[PDB]
């Protein structure tokens, strides 16, 4: 358990309030740079997004992971990534659970099924 949780809990930071938006606050090219130039960190409050939600636009589960290979994020961050057939908010950490389950399950799809794709895993 303990294990599975940690890699499927995701994080929540606070050095940033007036964050997200239905319509981009100022911009994206800005929303972000405001990151490499301090204040609100990757994951944090918002009405529709966190820096991560934008800094990381991953294609395969691979990437998202290949990312974690290099000290960019830590499985638990909320990154944008296309899984199977659509765009998903989830963490490199949650996704992995699946595949894990999936593969060794045989059908990477029916897996996703039973799974509760978004929420801390547990007993």
């Amino acid at each position: 358990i303990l294990g599975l949780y940690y890699i499927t809990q995701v994080r929540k930071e606070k050095k940033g309030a007036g964050m997200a938006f239905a319509t981009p606050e100022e911009a994206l090219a800005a929303y972000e740079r405001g990151e490499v130039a301090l204040n609100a960190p990757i994951v944090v409050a918002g009405r529709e997004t966190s820096v991560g939600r934008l800094k990381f636009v991953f294609a395969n589960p691979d990437e998202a992971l290949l990312a974690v290979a290099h000290g960019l994020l830590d499985l638990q961050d909320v990154v944008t990534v296309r899984y199977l057939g659509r765009r998903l908010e989830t963490s490199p950490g949650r996704i992995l659970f699946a595949r894990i389950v999936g593969e060794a399950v045989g059908d990477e799809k029916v897996a996703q099924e039973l799974i509760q794709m978004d929420v801390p895993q547990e007993k």
């Binding site: 994080r11 930071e13 960190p41 000290g71 830590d74």
Partner: protein, 49 residues
């Protein structure tokens, strides 16, 4: 630590990276040199392994 800086070293990527998250975790007081986030933490009875 007086032993380590005395040798000539002083924390490396491995360590900081910890302290990197050690703060995001609030066990460490943010906004303080890597070195301190260590002591701060060290005194917190733990450390990097």
């Amino acid at each position: 630590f007086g032993k380590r800086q005395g040798e000539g070293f002083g924390v490396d990527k491995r360590e900081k990276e910890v302290l990197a998250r050690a703060e995001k975790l609030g066990l460490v007081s943010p906004g303080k040199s890597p070195e301190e986030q260590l002591k701060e933490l060290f005194d917190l009875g733990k450390v990097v392994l």
